[PDB]
Amino acid sequence: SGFRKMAFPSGKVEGCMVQVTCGTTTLNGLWLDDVVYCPRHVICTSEDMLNPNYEDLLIRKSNHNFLVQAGNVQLRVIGHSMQNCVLKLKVDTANPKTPKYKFVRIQPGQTFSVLACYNGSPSGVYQCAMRPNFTIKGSFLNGSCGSVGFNIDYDCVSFCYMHHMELPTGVHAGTDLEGNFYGPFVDRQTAQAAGTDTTITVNVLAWLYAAVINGDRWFLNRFTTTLNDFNLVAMKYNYEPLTQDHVDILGPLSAQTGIAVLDMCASLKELLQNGMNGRTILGSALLEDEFTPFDVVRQCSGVTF
Amino acid sequence: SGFRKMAFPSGKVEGCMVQVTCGTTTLNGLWLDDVVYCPRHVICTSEDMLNPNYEDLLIRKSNHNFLVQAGNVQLRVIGHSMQNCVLKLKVDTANPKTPKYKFVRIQPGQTFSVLACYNGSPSGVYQCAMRPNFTIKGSFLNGSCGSVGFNIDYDCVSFCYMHHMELPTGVHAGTDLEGNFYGPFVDRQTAQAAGTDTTITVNVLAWLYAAVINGDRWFLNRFTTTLNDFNLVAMKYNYEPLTQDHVDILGPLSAQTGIAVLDMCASLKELLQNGMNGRTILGSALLEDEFTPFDVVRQCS
Ligand SMILES: O=C(NCc1ccc2c(c1)CCO2)c1ccccc1
Ligand code: NA
Known part of the structure; x- marks a missing residue:
């Protein structure tokens, strides 16, 4: 008996979480096969954030401008490219902990587990729903960008969300793992607001x-x-x-x-x-x-995973 | 911003969950170093659940009566002993996934995460608190016995609860990892009821x-x-x-x-x-x- 808000077990995802630093901005990345995925706004200074040109901001960065730490071990970035609003860092080592996985885009009303992360270190796990207004009622503090959301369907982890920003009302906005935002939001510091839910x-x-x-x-x-x-x-x-x-x-x-x-x-x-x-x-x-x-x-x- | 009932990331505990079988009974065990911990009532039989004499039931068991399965692998039991209400099965393999850990008995009002498991495999993770009446308001189905509750402050897993039973109001009761029950409950199917919460x-x-x-x-x-x-x-x-x-x-x-x-x-x-x-x-x-x-x-x- 009993009924609780219950997240998927997070171990398969914890093994994919890494720290990404570009300059003075540290956030979280997702390490799968030989690619690290993270928000493209990691490359912006706070002045760039008002109206960024991401293609231009990226060309100046070399590969060694992206410091990736998997735990206490450094990874070598050998390539970098952008897809929609997520940056893809090619690294020289495939993640030996890569689970069986897919990237899926979810519909409003569908639920998923969030692994909240700071400095590439998982700190908590909770259940979220994609709201009808395409926000999520998350719990995030500074440093949580790049934390991810997921479901586990059988043994395959379906990644569905990566955290990008917090709106003025305190709810949260992000993308699928192919970099497309959920909802009518953009990754820049201008006036944005959640619609009535x-x-x-x-x-x-x-x-x-x-x-x-x-x-x-x-x-x-x-x-x-x-x-x-x-x-x-x-x-x-x-x-x-x-x-x-x-x-x-x-x-x-x-x-x-x-x-x-x-x-x-x-x-x-x-x-x-x-x-x-x-x-x-x-x-x-x-x-x-x-x-x-x-x-x-x-x-x-009681369908175990 | 935001405030959520947040559990701890469960990976360090996922790597310790095994399945323990004795007779026709299967539940979960917790595999730390070379010991598997599980509720001692796995050794009870059908007609002997109101007043088990665990000392008498245990002395009749040999190590090969315990079937312990870690994933697809069979672990070899090389010893056993009872500590209060938990059974401690010595195995021939130390768990390579064993985290830094400790055992901590918690007081009422303390919170912890529960990794619900069935047949040695994790189902879900959620947050709980030890009620003032020493029960917890969990989500457990048949076969969840042996699921554990924990905190992970710093990098060390503090194990504070192991699930043993469901009381008639639908709330749940269990032990610390030293096998001592929280509250006045016993691992018997005699009439038991939780105090007013x-x-x-x-x-x-x-x-x-x-x-x-x-x-x-x-x-x-x-x-x-x-x-x-x-x-x-x-x-x-x-x-x-x-x-x-x-x-x-x-x-x-x-x-x-x-x-x-x-x-x-x-x-x-x-x-x-x-x-x-x-x-x-x-x-x-x-x-x-x-x-x-x-x-x-x-x-x-
Ligand atoms: O907790 C339940 N069973 C576990 C159990 C508890 C005490 C005990 C034994 C087993 C054997 C010896 O004493 C349960 C309760 C209500 C409905 C379904 C299950
Ligand atoms: Na009706």
């Missing part, structure tokens, strides 16, 4: 199913609804619209608990319209939306 | 200090309180008593924010009285008690 509806429903499996059932009721009716209510409370593909995805959980999705939507509608009436669900007083359906299935069936 | 007051205060550090002040007030008056109010909300030790511990967070510890106790009293009135603190609509003063300092600026 919304709640991930399919994830809230998944978490209600998890609550039921753990014996938390007070919110269930006799009613059911329709997609049209519910989606009107969802729009009213700044929830993402529920689609037929979401209902199919929650299909397994509906069969296991005997609560149809629109049966549970009637529960969620009543909670949105009336509150929780002093009660909690899985120890939360607010509706939790950073557990996907797959997360609930995996934690409630 | 209470909120860890010093931790809530730490977390309120965290909210201020990250820029939120809405819950402060112009008031203060004596320590005894605070405890008289807080006990009525099932909160743990706050001690002078706790006040001393919050000293640093107090100095960093400018808010005296007893001034923050006054803010907590008001929050208990008023609720949140639709607002949230660090993302929660409830008061959070699984961040220690030490946690807040490591995570915040």
